[PDB]
Design an enzyme around this catalytic site. Structure first.
Site, PDB file in Angstrom:
ATOM      1  N   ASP A   1       0.906  -1.209   0.000  1.00 30.20           N
ATOM      2  CA  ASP A   1       0.000   0.000   0.000  1.00 30.20           C
ATOM      3  C   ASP A   1       0.939   1.253   0.000  1.00 30.20           C
ATOM      4  O   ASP A   1       2.051   1.137   0.525  1.00 30.20           O
ATOM      5  CB  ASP A   1      -0.816  -0.117   1.301  1.00 30.20           C
ATOM      6  CG  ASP A   1      -1.457   1.167   1.754  1.00 30.20           C
ATOM      7  OD1 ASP A   1      -2.509   1.539   1.197  1.00 30.20           O
ATOM      8  OD2 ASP A   1      -0.929   1.768   2.684  1.00 30.20           O
TER       9      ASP A   1
ATOM     10  N   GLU B   1       0.379  -0.436  -4.967  1.00 32.16           N
ATOM     11  CA  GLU B   1      -0.441   0.798  -5.168  1.00 32.16           C
ATOM     12  C   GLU B   1       0.478   1.984  -5.039  1.00 32.16           C
ATOM     13  O   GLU B   1       1.105   2.170  -3.999  1.00 32.16           O
ATOM     14  CB  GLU B   1      -1.593   0.933  -4.198  1.00 32.16           C
ATOM     15  CG  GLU B   1      -2.334   2.281  -4.284  1.00 32.16           C
ATOM     16  CD  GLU B   1      -1.763   3.292  -3.294  1.00 32.16           C
ATOM     17  OE1 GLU B   1      -1.808   2.925  -2.128  1.00 32.16           O
ATOM     18  OE2 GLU B   1      -1.250   4.333  -3.723  1.00 32.16           O
TER      19      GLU B   1
END
Ligand SMILES: [Mg+2]
Ligand SMILES: [Mg+2]
Ligand SMILES: [Mg+2]
Ligand SMILES: [Mg+2]
Length: 755
Positions: free
Chosen positions: A430, A483
């Site tokens: 993330d 991401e």
């Protein structure tokens, strides 16, 4: 080796097989060394030595007996290798069982760790069951180079460490052997720093931990607690390219999928434990164990038809409300849900059911909690000392010093650890931007540039590349998903090509375009046709994963139904159209739990999902919709073989903005697997709508999101449609379709149909 020595091994007469098996130095040359690796592999017919970090593989030869193998290799150092072992028609890849003759740190272990290159450091740091001087016990070791003293405190000495002071090795690492204790031992390290201040730390390399908010580490005999059955899964993975397969991920937060009753014990794999209460405000509820999740989540997923489960971070973390993103026990699966072997059982059962497991992995930061890594030895040890690169002030957390060898090693080895010990199939990272930029969430005059004047965080870029280089060398076939929200280039491209080495990137722009689009009243979507089509402009610059994640159904954003305009019928219809489009658009797929049955409320990490909704037909229909869509996705090559090649997609027409209609082809290797996809993103039905197609013939209506079994109005083409010889959209043939309202059709040529 002699036949006599071989036979001693084969018949279990040898006094110490480590003398012969494993890796042994034969000679030293001027610029290199000659090594032998030996293995006894009963029932194997063939074996190879893989040196994954050099990208080499050398056959082993049987020597004196068909199951006794040797391999002679010349290279300056042979620190990193695996054995590939063939038994009949099956191959497995393992670490050498005779790699480590002693439980203590060797000189070589210390040197490799000092250099940042000990890929298996977690075999020696932490707590390990073993034997020293003839006596069984636990060996403890911890990196704390600036501590004045360190002692082992635990249940075994009533938390008094005076007779269990550790010994410092090489000015860097503390060790101790404790006889006659074993797995289950509860402990911490008691550190005194250079100021004389005394405090307690959990084991950074600990394998198990008490249940939050307690923080003692617990000794695990990690290689003798679980028997795996997933060799065939692991073989197929290693021999396949997941980029060319269907990848439909069900994203799950383990603590909030389903809760049980706290009035009973938590059952475990052959055992039980006291319940872990979800919160003080909901005291009648407990978490489910890894074991209960294997029995319940896995068949649910299998029946829905997803190929993968992606978990929010399962590494040990002190606060439920971080969702797992503030980790303090990087080498242990959270004890909320039971023991290490229960999670092993979960993964093994996924693999038995043909489901892969992706872990959210959190290398970007860590919280300040005093049991954790912060200021570990009375210096800035894991975090960088300069707060301009060592703190994320808006988050209240600390940032690893990625340039410091032993810190780099902690994290690189940690990624490998999860694939090694827990057999996982992928990781997802993330907020990659948080690592890549020295000015991340920092105002002017509060950060400093890299040595070339730029904002790139050089040390973090180098670490990310090393992680991904190693991961794919040791575990080919895995998924490494990022991401990254700043248009950093070549995220999902090989390192040798200047990339960061991931194989998939979340298409956040796609996600925003779609959810913004669908939230628009349908009459207004004509002003925003570009949301539908724009992401295809940059699409081939990365390998994209189309993710509609947990982050999109919290904080006032609504759950999926709630985002959609109109009456209840239309809200459902919008959800089916959006997801049919998502599954037909190029890229792999991820969606979060609750999306598949139309939960109305936002995800709440403190409760479980609103399962009672599945008592009602509209939720049941939506769930059937997703079940059928996952099935279609796996059954149609044109939806997954060519995601990432121009061949796999072409728009037919995307100019009719005034009716919010678009259409396109997907293709695979066989031209007869081509699919025609037509989208109608308003509630206006169209009784005759012409679409160009590339071949004459009957086009079966293979899927229709308005079918009545999905909650739609059951409008459509009654099985399919004959193409006309009537040029349209620059193709020689064309279909005169009925387009249902707020719906997507998938059509496929049946070239054997009778005219
Ligand atoms: Mg004391
Ligand atoms: Mg974010
Ligand atoms: Mg716009
Ligand atoms: Mg509930």
């Amino acid at each position: 080796i002699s036949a006599d020595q071989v036979n001693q091994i084969i018949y279990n007469l040898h006094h110490d097989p480590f003398e012969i098996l494993g890796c042994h130095l034969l000679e030293e040359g001027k610029n290199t060394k000659k090594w032998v690796v030996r293995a006894y592999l009963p029932k194997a017919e063939a074996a190879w030595v893989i040196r994954p970090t050099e990208r080499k593989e050398d056959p082993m030869n049987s020597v004196h007996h068909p199951n006794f193998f040797e391999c002679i290799i010349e290279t300056p150092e042979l620190n990193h290798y695996q054995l590939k072992v063939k038994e009949g028609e099956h191959e497995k890849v393992i670490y050498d069982p005779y790699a480590f003759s002693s439980p203590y740190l060797t000189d070589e272990d210390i040197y490799l760790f000092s250099e940042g290159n000990h890929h298996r450091i977690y075999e020696k740091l932490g707590a390990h069951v073993g034997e020293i001087n003839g006596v069984k016990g636990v060996y403890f070791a911890v990196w704390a180079p600036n501590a004045r003293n360190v002692s082992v405190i635990g249940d075994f000495n009533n938390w008094d460490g005076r007779e269990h002071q550790m010994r410092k090795r090489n000015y860097t690492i503390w060790e101790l052997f404790v006889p006659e204790i074993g797995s289950g031992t509860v402990y911490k390290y008691e550190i005194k720093n250079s100021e004389g201040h005394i405090y307690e730390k959990s084991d950074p390399y600990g394998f198990y931990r008490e249940v939050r908010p307690n923080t003692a580490s617990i000794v695990v005999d990690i290689d003798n607690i679980y028997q795996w059955h997933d060799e065939e899964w692991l073989e197929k993975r290693r021999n396949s390219d997941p980029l060319k397969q269907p990848v439909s991920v069900y994203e799950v937060h383990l603590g909030s999928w389903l809760h049980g009753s706290s009035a009973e014990k938590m059952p475990l794999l052959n055992g039980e434990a006291d319940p872990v209460i979800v919160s003080e405000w909901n005291p009648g509820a407990r978490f489910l164990s890894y074991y209960e999740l294997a029995e319940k989540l896995i068949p649910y997923v299998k029946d829905m038809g997803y190929t993968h489960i992606e978990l929010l971070p399962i590494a040990e973390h002190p606060f439920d409300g971080s969702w797992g993103y503030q980790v303090t026990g990087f080498y242990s699966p959270t004890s909320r849900f039971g023991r290490p072997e229960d999670f092993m059982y979960f993964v093994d059962k996924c693999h038995e059911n043909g489901i892969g497991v992706i872990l959210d992995w959190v290398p970007g930061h860590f919280p300040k909690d005093s049991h954790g890594l912060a200021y570990f030895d009375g210096t800035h040890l894991y975090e960088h000392a300069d707060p301009r690169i060592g703190e994320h002030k808006e988050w209240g957390t600390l940032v690893f010093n990625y340039g410091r060898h032993e810190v780099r090693n902690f994290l690189v080895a940690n990624v490998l650890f999860w694939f090694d010990k827990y057999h996982v199939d992928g990781i997802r990272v993330d907020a990659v931007a948080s690592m890549l930029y020295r000015n991340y969430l920092r105002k002017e005059g509060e950060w400093i540039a890299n040595e070339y004047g730029g904002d790139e965080h050089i040390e973090a870029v180098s670490f990310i590349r090393e992680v991904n280089t190693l991961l794919f060398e040791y575990f080919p076939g895995i998924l490494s998903i990022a991401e990254e929200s700043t248009e950093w280039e070549k995220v999902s491209r090989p390192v040798a090509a200047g990339g960061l080495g991931f194989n998939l990137k979340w298409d956040m722009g796609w996600m925003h375009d779609m959810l913004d689009y669908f939230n628009i009243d349908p009459y207004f979507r004509q002003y925003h046709q570009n949301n539908v089509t724009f992401s295809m402009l940059y699409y081939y610059n990365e390998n994209f994963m189309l993710a509609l994640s947990h982050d999109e159904i919290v904080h006032g954003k609504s759950n999926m139904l709630g985002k959609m305009p109109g009456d209840e019928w239309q809200k459902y219809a919008n959800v089916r159209a959006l997801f049919t489009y998502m599954y037909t658009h190029p890229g792999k797929k991820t969606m979060f739990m609750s999306m598949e049955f139309g939960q109305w409320s936002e995800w709440n990490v403190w409760g479980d999902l609103e399962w009672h909704l599945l008592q009602y037909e509209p939720h049941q229909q939506l769930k059937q919709f997703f079940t059928d869509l996952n099935a279609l996705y796996q059954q149609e090559p044109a939806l997954y073989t060519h995601d990432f090649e121009y061949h796999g997609f072409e728009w037919i027409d995307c100019n009719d903005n005034t009716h919010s209609v678009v259409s396109f082809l997907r293709r695979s290797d066989d031209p007869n697997d081509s699919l025609v996809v037509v989208c109608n993103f308003t509630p206006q039905p169209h009784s005759h709508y012409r679409i160009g197609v590339p071949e004459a013939g009957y086009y079966v209506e293979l899927f229709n999101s308005d079918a009545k079994q999905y909650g739609g109005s059951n409008m459509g083409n009654l099985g399919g449609k004959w193409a006309d010889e009537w040029s349209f959209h620059n193709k020689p043939y064309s279909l005169d379709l009925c387009l249902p309202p707020l719906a997507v059709l998938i059509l496929k040529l049946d070239p054997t149909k009778v005219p």
